[PDB]
Amino acid sequence: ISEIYIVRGQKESVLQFLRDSFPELIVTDYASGGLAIEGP
Amino acid sequence: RTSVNRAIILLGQVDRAPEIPIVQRIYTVRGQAADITALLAAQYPTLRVT
């Protein structure tokens, strides 16, 4: 499923962390639109 | 039929109308002040006279 997480704080924080603890996920970035987390 | 719904929700964020820089001025009413408050609340009904 794909959901949208609007970045609240810093950008790379929600970027760098999210790949580490969740490599089984993909974040589709929408420039200034936030994120589009999808996967399992 | 699904990518549209996802595009619209996204599109609201990326597309916003230009904002209006609300300015402040202080008026020193000459005459009554209750009547010139009611005037500015019928004329120009979005001025925020405090």
Alpha helices by DSSP H, listed for chain A, are: 11-21
Q: Which tokens go with A20? A: 């580490």
Q: How far apart are the first and last CA of chain A?
A: 7
Closest chain A C-alpha to B5 CA, distance in angstroms: 12
Is the distance from CB of A14 to CB of A5 less than 8 angstroms?
yes
Residue of A nearest to B12 (CA): A33
- Interatomic CA distance for residues A16 and A39, integer angstroms: 17
Does B6 sit within 8 Å of A2, measured CB to CB? yes
Q: What is the resolution of this structure in A?
A: 2.6
- Name the experiment that determined this structure: cryo-EM
Alpha-carbon gap, residue B40 to B22, rounded angstroms: 17
- Which pairs from B37-42 meet CB under 8 Å and 24+ separation? none
> What CA–CA distance (Å, rounded) separates B30 from B21?
28
Per-residue buried b or exposed e for A11-21, using 16+ beta carbons within 10 Å of the residue's own CB: eeebeeebeee
Partners of residue A30 in chain B, C-beta under 8 Å: 10, 13-14
Q: Tell me the residues of B at the A interface, defined by beta carbons under 8 Å apart.
A: 6, 9-10, 13-14
Report which DSSP code applies to A11: H
φ, ψ for residue A34, nearest 5 deg? 100, -130
Ramachandran assignment for B16, one of left (phi > 0), alpha (psi -120 to 50 degrees), beta (any other): beta
